[PDB]
Amino acid sequence: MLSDEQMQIINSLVEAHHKTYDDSYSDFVRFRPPVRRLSMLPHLADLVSYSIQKVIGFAKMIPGFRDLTAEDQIALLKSSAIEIIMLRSNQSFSLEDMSWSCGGPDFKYCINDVTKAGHTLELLEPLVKFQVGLKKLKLHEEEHVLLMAICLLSPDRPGVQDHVRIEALQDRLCDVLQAYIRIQHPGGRLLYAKMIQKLADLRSLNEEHSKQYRSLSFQPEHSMQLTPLVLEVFGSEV
Amino acid sequence: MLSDEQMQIINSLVEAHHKTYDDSYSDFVRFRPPVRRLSMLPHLADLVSYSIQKVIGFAKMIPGFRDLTAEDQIALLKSSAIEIIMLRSNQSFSLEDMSWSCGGPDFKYCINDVTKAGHTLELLEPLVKFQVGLKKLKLHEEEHVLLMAICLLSPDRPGVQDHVRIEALQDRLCDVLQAYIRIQHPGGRLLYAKMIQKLADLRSLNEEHSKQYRSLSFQPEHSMQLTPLVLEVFGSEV
């Protein structure tokens, strides 16, 4: 069984998800429209910028993230944002279409659409394979959310000063995750191991995106297309 | 009569205008859509950002602007951009509607629409009165263009090092302007004086906009809505 304190974590994490994920995607109409070579980068940079704001909102409701120092909250978000956006977009990724479907068709993102925002297939290939591997796991919502808070609360990230406090928080989430799969997921006897692998798969995707973003930001003709938040989060400032 | 060298200035200035002013406004559909309180600021910040790029293109074709040092080209644009945008938008300002008409109706900008981008009527009132005063002058295109290059080429601007070279260029434009009205404008015997007044009216508008932009940029919830170019041009960096 699960503790009452272990399930308040799950409740507050699930409540912190619905708040920051709009299943109607009704705010996409407010982005720079899509165009279908750097076309489509205005749209996707707007999309990503919106996603970062919903990640920050999600983080602030993780039990105990708000109690960290501002330097550590900034530091964890600066290194984990792009991982959590790839993570949370699994909810709109379709195995049938191999695209993300957000209420289009103007918001249906094939590989042809995402190749046009300045990133090579050397990032889009692993990301799409990541998306089917995660969608095939058929995670419950409670498990999808926990993996977000676990991924955010990793201390092996550049810039963290309080390695003891956030590790303590992250371990607490894994134990809630392991208990959840024991009690509530039928046949999940391998699942916690595959999910932890997905964390390591996320790091290979971050490292690549961080590599290709540096090429985009050294070209001011493309860097001026991004939004000020994107420039701050993916920036290299301490 | 006019010199052959005086009319190459007018030719190259007029050619540098059509290039950087699209009378079809067919690139507005690429801005963050309008919404009709800080609504409408996404759109208008995109609009202004696009306008700055067309001003920079115009400047680079002014005869002798490209020969200045990069510090002076940056410095003149940083202080004069917002004046030239107000200037060049006279071409779409309608006296009948008291609005700017750019091929709407989604791109028709009443005062209600422009009050919503974070600026008070303490800026919108003088600006609209400026727009009718300039539209009532019924400037030829040759005179409208010259006033842009004259306004850009002012040396009494913060950050200019070569006061002698650009004053020499600006004076050359005024003499072309005065000759043009002598020879080509019937009844313009007061016109060069009213146009020079418009330059001074432009400075009161700049000073105000610079004042209200400082309030917008000290609020990060609004400053993140602007574009990276806007932040550079209207920024206070040297």
Partner: peptide
Amino acid sequence: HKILHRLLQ
């Protein structure tokens, strides 16, 4: 990090 601080309240 002006916007991040502001976004974290």
